[PDB]
C-alpha cells in the first residue's frame, strides 16, 4: 500500500535490479529475511515497492510457502509437445 512519495533513497530500479540478481542466485526463491541480510539498509516500503514492482513487472515470481512469502526468478516450464 504505497504511501506518499518515498524520496531520494536508493533508486528504485537499482533496488529492483538487486532483487533480480538475487532471484538469479537463488532459483528456489528468496525470503524477505534474505533481502534483509542482503540489504538491511533498504527501506520497508522500498523493499516491498521494488518487490511489488518486480512482481508486477513480471521479473520476480512470488511463491507463498510456509511462514512468509518467497520470491524467485520468473519463468515458465517447457511444453510437453
Swiss-Prot record:
Ubl conjugation is among the record's keywords: yes
Q: List the disulfide bonds.
A: none
Keywords (A to Z) from UniProt? Acetylation, Antiviral defense, DNA-directed RNA polymerase, Immunity, Innate immunity, Iron, Iron-sulfur, Isopeptide bond, Metal-binding, Nucleus, Transcription, Ubl conjugation
Per UniProt, subcellular location reads as: Nucleus
GO BP, sorted A to Z? defense response to virus; innate immune response; positive regulation of innate immune response; positive regulation of interferon-beta production; transcription by RNA polymerase III
Claim: Nucleus is one of the keywords in the record? yes
What is a GO molecular function of this protein? Answer: metal ion binding
Naming one, the record's GO cellular component terms include:
RNA polymerase III complex
User: Mainly resides where?
Assistant: nucleus
Q: Tell me, how does this one assemble? A: Component of the RNA polymerase III complex consisting of 17 subunits: a ten-subunit horseshoe-shaped catalytic core composed of POLR3A/RPC1, POLR3B/RPC2, POLR1C/RPAC1, POLR1D/RPAC2, POLR3K/RPC10, POLR2E/RPABC1, POLR2F/RPABC2, POLR2H/RPABC3, POLR2K/RPABC4 and POLR2L/RPABC5; a mobile stalk composed of two subunits POLR3H/RPC8 and CRCP/RPC9, protruding from the core and functioning primarily in transcription initiation; and additional subunits homologous to general transcription factors of the RNA polymerase II machinery, POLR3C/RPC3-POLR3F/RPC6-POLR3G/RPC7 heterotrimer required for transcription initiation and POLR3D/RPC4-POLR3E/RPC5 heterodimer involved in both transcription initiation and termination.
By sequence similarity, the record places it as follows:
Belongs to the eukaryotic RPC34/RPC39 RNA polymerase subunit family.
Q: What is known of its domains?
A: The [4FE-4S] cluster-binding domain adopts a globular structure that serves as an interaction hub that connects the POLR3C/RPC3-POLR3F/RPC6-POLR3G/RPC7 heterotrimer to the Pol III core.
State the protein's purpose.
DNA-dependent RNA polymerase catalyzes the transcription of DNA into RNA using the four ribonucleoside triphosphates as substrates. Specific peripheric component of RNA polymerase III (Pol III) which synthesizes small non-coding RNAs including 5S rRNA, snRNAs, tRNAs and miRNAs from at least 500 distinct genomic loci. Part of POLR3C/RPC3-POLR3F/RPC6-POLR3G/RPC7 heterotrimer that coordinates the dynamics of Pol III stalk and clamp modules during the transition from apo to elongation state.
Q: What is this protein called?
A: DNA-directed RNA polymerase III subunit RPC6
Q: Which gene encodes it?
A: Polr3f
